[PDB]
Each structure stands twice: as C-alpha cells, then as structure tokens.
Design a protein around this motif. Structure first.
Motif, PDB file in Angstrom:
ATOM      1  N   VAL A  80      46.534  52.122  45.024  1.00  0.00           N
ATOM      2  CA  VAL A  80      46.564  51.897  43.594  1.00  0.00           C
ATOM      3  C   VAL A  80      47.710  50.961  43.222  1.00  0.00           C
ATOM      4  CG1 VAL A  80      46.913  53.045  41.357  1.00  0.00           C
ATOM      5  CG2 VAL A  80      45.398  54.061  43.053  1.00  0.00           C
ATOM      6  N   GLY A  81      47.409  50.006  42.331  1.00  0.00           N
ATOM      7  CA  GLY A  81      48.380  49.029  41.892  1.00  0.00           C
ATOM      8  C   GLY A  81      49.196  49.525  40.718  1.00  0.00           C
ATOM      9  N   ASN A  82      49.973  48.627  40.124  1.00  0.00           N
ATOM     10  CA  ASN A  82      50.906  48.961  39.037  1.00  0.00           C
ATOM     11  C   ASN A  82      50.326  48.658  37.663  1.00  0.00           C
ATOM     12  OD1 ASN A  82      53.098  49.552  40.912  1.00  0.00           O
ATOM     13  ND2 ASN A  82      53.171  47.318  41.237  1.00  0.00           N
ATOM     14  N   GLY A  83      50.690  49.489  36.686  1.00  0.00           N
ATOM     15  CA  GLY A  83      50.253  49.301  35.308  1.00  0.00           C
ATOM     16  C   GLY A  83      48.753  49.220  35.114  1.00  0.00           C
ATOM     17  N   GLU A  84      48.349  48.385  34.161  1.00  0.00           N
ATOM     18  CA  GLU A  84      46.940  48.314  33.762  1.00  0.00           C
ATOM     19  C   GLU A  84      46.362  46.897  33.857  1.00  0.00           C
ATOM     20  OE1 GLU A  84      46.277  50.410  30.032  1.00  0.00           O
ATOM     21  OE2 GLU A  84      47.322  52.214  30.755  1.00  0.00           O
ATOM     22  N   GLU A  85      47.218  45.883  33.833  1.00  0.00           N
ATOM     23  CA  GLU A  85      46.724  44.516  33.696  1.00  0.00           C
ATOM     24  C   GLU A  85      45.996  43.982  34.931  1.00  0.00           C
ATOM     25  OE1 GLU A  85      49.802  41.890  32.537  1.00  0.00           O
ATOM     26  OE2 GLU A  85      51.045  42.196  34.345  1.00  0.00           O
ATOM     27  N   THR A  86      44.938  43.218  34.677  1.00  0.00           N
ATOM     28  CA  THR A  86      44.138  42.559  35.709  1.00  0.00           C
ATOM     29  C   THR A  86      44.049  41.080  35.340  1.00  0.00           C
ATOM     30  OG1 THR A  86      42.035  43.164  34.581  1.00  0.00           O
ATOM     31  CG2 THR A  86      42.912  44.613  36.254  1.00  0.00           C
ATOM     32  N   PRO A  87      43.783  40.219  36.339  1.00  0.00           N
ATOM     33  CA  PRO A  87      43.884  38.786  36.106  1.00  0.00           C
ATOM     34  C   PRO A  87      42.765  38.193  35.226  1.00  0.00           C
ATOM     35  CG  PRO A  87      43.354  39.240  38.447  1.00  0.00           C
ATOM     36  CD  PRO A  87      43.666  40.566  37.776  1.00  0.00           C
ATOM     37  N   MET A  88      43.096  37.125  34.491  1.00  0.00           N
ATOM     38  CA  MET A  88      42.165  36.427  33.619  1.00  0.00           C
ATOM     39  C   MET A  88      41.565  35.251  34.368  1.00  0.00           C
ATOM     40  SD  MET A  88      42.702  37.932  30.886  1.00  0.00           S
ATOM     41  CE  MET A  88      43.772  38.894  29.798  1.00  0.00           C
ATOM     42  N   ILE A  89      40.422  34.775  33.893  1.00  0.00           N
ATOM     43  CA  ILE A  89      39.841  33.535  34.404  1.00  0.00           C
ATOM     44  C   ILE A  89      40.839  32.382  34.299  1.00  0.00           C
ATOM     45  CG2 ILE A  89      38.029  31.804  34.049  1.00  0.00           C
ATOM     46  CD1 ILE A  89      36.225  34.242  33.288  1.00  0.00           C
ATOM     47  N   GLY A  90      40.921  31.601  35.369  1.00  0.00           N
ATOM     48  CA  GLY A  90      41.910  30.565  35.496  1.00  0.00           C
ATOM     49  C   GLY A  90      43.302  30.937  35.976  1.00  0.00           C
ATOM     50  N   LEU A 107      41.215  32.078  39.595  1.00  0.00           N
ATOM     51  CA  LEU A 107      40.181  33.067  39.413  1.00  0.00           C
ATOM     52  C   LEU A 107      39.024  32.590  38.562  1.00  0.00           C
ATOM     53  CD1 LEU A 107      39.772  36.123  40.044  1.00  0.00           C
ATOM     54  CD2 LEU A 107      40.401  36.518  37.695  1.00  0.00           C
ATOM     55  N   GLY A 108      37.811  32.874  39.012  1.00  0.00           N
ATOM     56  CA  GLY A 108      36.639  32.751  38.160  1.00  0.00           C
ATOM     57  C   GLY A 108      36.183  31.313  38.029  1.00  0.00           C
ATOM     58  N   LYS A 109      36.553  30.494  39.008  1.00  0.00           N
ATOM     59  CA  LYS A 109      36.225  29.067  38.980  1.00  0.00           C
ATOM     60  C   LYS A 109      35.298  28.644  40.112  1.00  0.00           C
ATOM     61  CE  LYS A 109      38.861  27.743  35.451  1.00  0.00           C
ATOM     62  NZ  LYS A 109      38.305  27.661  34.062  1.00  0.00           N
ATOM     63  N   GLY A 110      34.847  29.582  40.944  1.00  0.00           N
ATOM     64  CA  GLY A 110      33.996  29.239  42.086  1.00  0.00           C
ATOM     65  C   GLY A 110      34.739  28.574  43.243  1.00  0.00           C
ATOM     66  N   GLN A 111      36.071  28.693  43.251  1.00  0.00           N
ATOM     67  CA  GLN A 111      36.928  28.245  44.358  1.00  0.00           C
ATOM     68  C   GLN A 111      36.806  29.175  45.569  1.00  0.00           C
ATOM     69  OE1 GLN A 111      41.089  27.754  43.264  1.00  0.00           O
ATOM     70  NE2 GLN A 111      40.622  26.186  41.705  1.00  0.00           N
ATOM     71  N   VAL A 112      36.205  30.346  45.354  1.00  0.00           N
ATOM     72  CA  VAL A 112      35.971  31.365  46.397  1.00  0.00           C
ATOM     73  C   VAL A 112      34.567  31.930  46.257  1.00  0.00           C
ATOM     74  CG1 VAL A 112      38.351  32.035  46.693  1.00  0.00           C
ATOM     75  CG2 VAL A 112      37.043  33.078  44.871  1.00  0.00           C
ATOM     76  N   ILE A 113      34.115  32.688  47.253  1.00  0.00           N
ATOM     77  CA  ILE A 113      32.790  33.298  47.217  1.00  0.00           C
ATOM     78  C   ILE A 113      32.699  34.191  45.981  1.00  0.00           C
ATOM     79  CG2 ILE A 113      32.247  33.089  49.676  1.00  0.00           C
ATOM     80  CD1 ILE A 113      32.976  36.112  49.895  1.00  0.00           C
ATOM     81  N   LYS A 114      31.504  34.324  45.417  1.00  0.00           N
ATOM     82  CA  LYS A 114      31.304  35.103  44.174  1.00  0.00           C
ATOM     83  C   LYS A 114      31.914  36.522  44.246  1.00  0.00           C
ATOM     84  CE  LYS A 114      27.178  32.568  42.674  1.00  0.00           C
ATOM     85  NZ  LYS A 114      25.685  32.547  42.704  1.00  0.00           N
ATOM     86  N   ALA A 115      31.736  37.191  45.374  1.00  0.00           N
ATOM     87  CA  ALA A 115      32.264  38.539  45.584  1.00  0.00           C
ATOM     88  C   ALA A 115      33.770  38.662  45.303  1.00  0.00           C
ATOM     89  CB  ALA A 115      31.953  39.002  46.989  1.00  0.00           C
ATOM     90  N   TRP A 116      34.518  37.593  45.586  1.00  0.00           N
ATOM     91  CA  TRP A 116      35.963  37.556  45.348  1.00  0.00           C
ATOM     92  C   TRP A 116      36.258  37.322  43.872  1.00  0.00           C
ATOM     93  CZ3 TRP A 116      40.738  36.365  48.348  1.00  0.00           C
ATOM     94  CH2 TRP A 116      40.713  36.986  49.620  1.00  0.00           C
TER      95      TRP A 116
END
Ligand code: 5BH
Length: 127
Positions: A28-38, A69-78
């Motif tokens: 489990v990670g810290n706090g609540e925040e998760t990354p945004m697109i870009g 993130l969310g730019k198709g720089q990685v496989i969709k699953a990521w």
C-alpha cells in the motif's frame, strides 16, 4: 505463481470489465493521490511473459523507468494500471494481449497473443 494469484484474486480495472487488466496491490502506498494524464511518472518494475519465456527489470539497469501517463507511450495496461497507483505502492498486473501487444506482438521480445505479468512500484509523479 504470482500470475495465477492475480487471475484468482485480482481486481478488474478495465472500463469494459473484460478482465483484460487485473491488479493486486502488494504494498500500500501513501495518502490518497494518484497520477493525472500527462504526469511524468517514475517507476521501478519487473515484467515477464506469463509462461516465462522473457524477463525484464528496470532494477537490473539501475535506472527508474519514466513515462508520461495516459499518452500511449506505454502499453494500454500500464496507462490504465499506473493511473490507479499511489506513491510508494507496489502492485501486480496481469495484462491480456488486447491491453498489450495483441495479435501482432512485437519482434523479437513479444510473441503473438501474449499475456504479460508485471510488478510495478510507483516511486513518484509530477504534473
Ligand atoms: C516491446 O519492447 C519492449 C518491451 C518491454 C517490456 C514491456 O512490455 N514494457 C516495458 C515497461 C513498460 C511497459 C511495456 C511497454 O510499454 N513497453 C514499451 C512500448 N510498448 O511502448 C514502452 C517502453 C519500451 C517499449 C516487456 C519485455 C519482455 C518481458 C515483458 C515486458 C521491454 C523492452 O526493453 C527492455 C522492450 O524493448 C524496447
């Protein structure tokens, strides 16, 4: 193994709910925040074909893997999976071919119709 554990106990995190991307949180990670697109995301990971033929690890290179993130720089699953992570979290992801390299695969590492397994640690992210 870890792949079979994810099949049994993994959460389906796809929009379509087709079990294409299954996740188990291992740390489990810290706090609540998760990354945004870009966001620039920094990870360590280990990856392998589900059957085991190939293995890849950022740790073996002594270099965190970085992407936007969310730019198709990685496989969709990521793009789907990393978006769900908190800083310091470690998860396991099982990735059907349709969320990875599909029928074409990728020469020479990824055969056609390959399911991929990953361990991912989210080190940091920033917009
Ligand atoms: C298809 O090309 C590669 C794929 C990977 C690994 C891989 O599938 N990825 C690397 C870690 C991020 C997830 C995913 C990925 O998106 N790969 C890339 C892609 N498809 O655009 C983005 C970075 C490297 C190619 C696989 C290696 C075989 C074992 C299963 C994971 C590592 C690679 O190099 C270490 C690859 O060559 C550049």
């Amino acid at each position: 193994g870890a792949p079979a554990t994810v099949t049994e106990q993994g959460e389906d995190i796809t929009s379509k709910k087709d079990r294409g991307v299954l996740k188990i949180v291992k740390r489990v990670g810290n706090g609540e925040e998760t990354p945004m697109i870009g966001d620039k995301v920094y990870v360590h990971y280990k990856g392998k074909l589900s059957n085991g033929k190939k293995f890849d690890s950022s740790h073996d290179r002594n270099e965190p893997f970085v992407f936007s993130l969310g730019k198709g720089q990685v496989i969709k699953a990521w793009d789907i999976g990393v978006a769900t992570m908190k800083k310091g979290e470690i998860c396991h992801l099982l990735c059907k071919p349709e969320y990875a390299y599909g029928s074409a695969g990728s020469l020479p590492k990824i055969p056609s119709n390959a399911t991929l397994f990953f361990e991912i640690e989210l080190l940091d992210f920033k917009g």
